[PDB]
Design brief:
The structure is cut from a larger assembly and holds chains A (166 residues) and B (50 residues). Chain A is mainly alpha-helical and 166 residues long. Chain A is built from eight helices and four strands. In chain A, the strands form two sheets. In chain A, strands 1-2 form a two-stranded antiparallel ribbon. Chain A has a two-stranded antiparallel ribbon with strand order 3-4. Chain B has 50 residues and is mostly helical. Chain B has one helix and no strands. The termini of chain B are far apart. Chain B is rod-shaped. The chains are: A mainly alpha (166), B mainly alpha (50). The interface between A and B is medium-sized, with 34 and 26 residues.
């Protein structure tokens, strides 16, 4: 019970820190609705656009009972994001590096150890939650080397090492 | 046989694509937040030095 209580305390503290990082004013305890998806993702998880929609709808429903000032209260944001983070951590232990390795291996049936940047971008354009051309260009600039090859092991390691202190 | 194999490959590739897109969105947003925090810390240090 003490370990689970410490888990809750850590989740609440991390969500509070992420909320403070995105407060519109220092000490105002409010975060802009457009910044809510960014704050939730900065709270230490990488959920899909479906979960962005779910969390935004939940926070909007919670804020509907209060004044519709366009800002999300600290209490509501902490409750929603902490519940979602607890759900994620309990349902799956965040082995992000291995999950990304499996996802990248799904695109490499031959096990060549690398994925062509152009083919990978073309596949991502029409598969899954379609991203923008600017997002794809930034991704290939960050990942692809001078030879146009994406070493998915190193890329997954870098993705999982995105400053998330566990 | 080829159509069944291609359908299975397409399904797994779609799942992997969704996962990778979510993780890339998270990574980009985390990098933006880190840059914003670094800029704010530099501003605070500059103000303190005066």
């Amino acid at each position: 019970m003490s370990k689970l209580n410490d888990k809750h305390e850590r989740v609440r503290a991390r969500v509070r820190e992420a909320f403070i990082l995105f407060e519109h004013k220092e000490g105002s305890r409010l975060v802009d609705f457009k910044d809510v998806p960014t704050a939730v993702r900065a709270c230490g998880v990488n959920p899909t656009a479906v979960q962005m929609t779910h969390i935004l709808d939940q926070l909007a429903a919670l804020n509907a009972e209060t004044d519709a000032t366009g800002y999300v209260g600290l209490e509501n944001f902490e409750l929603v994001v902490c519940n979602f983070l607890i759900q994620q951590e309990a349902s799956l232990f965040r082995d992000d590096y291995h999950t990304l390795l499996r996802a990248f291996r799904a695109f490499d049936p031959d096990g060549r150890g690398f994925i062509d940047a152009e083919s990978f971008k073309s596949l991502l354009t029409g598969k899954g939650e379609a991203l923008s051309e600017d997002e794809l260009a930034k991704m290939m600039t960050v990942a692809a080397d001078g030879e146009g090859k994406i070493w998915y092991e190193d890329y997954a390691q870098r993705l999982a090492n995105d400053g998330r202190t566990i | 046989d080829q159509r069944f194999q291609a359908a299975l490959l397409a399904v797994r590739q779609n799942h992997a694509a969704r996962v990778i897109q979510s993780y890339w969105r998270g990574f980009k947003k985390a990098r933006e937040a880190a840059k914003k925090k670094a800029k704010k810390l530099e501003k605070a240090k500059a103000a303190k030095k005066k």
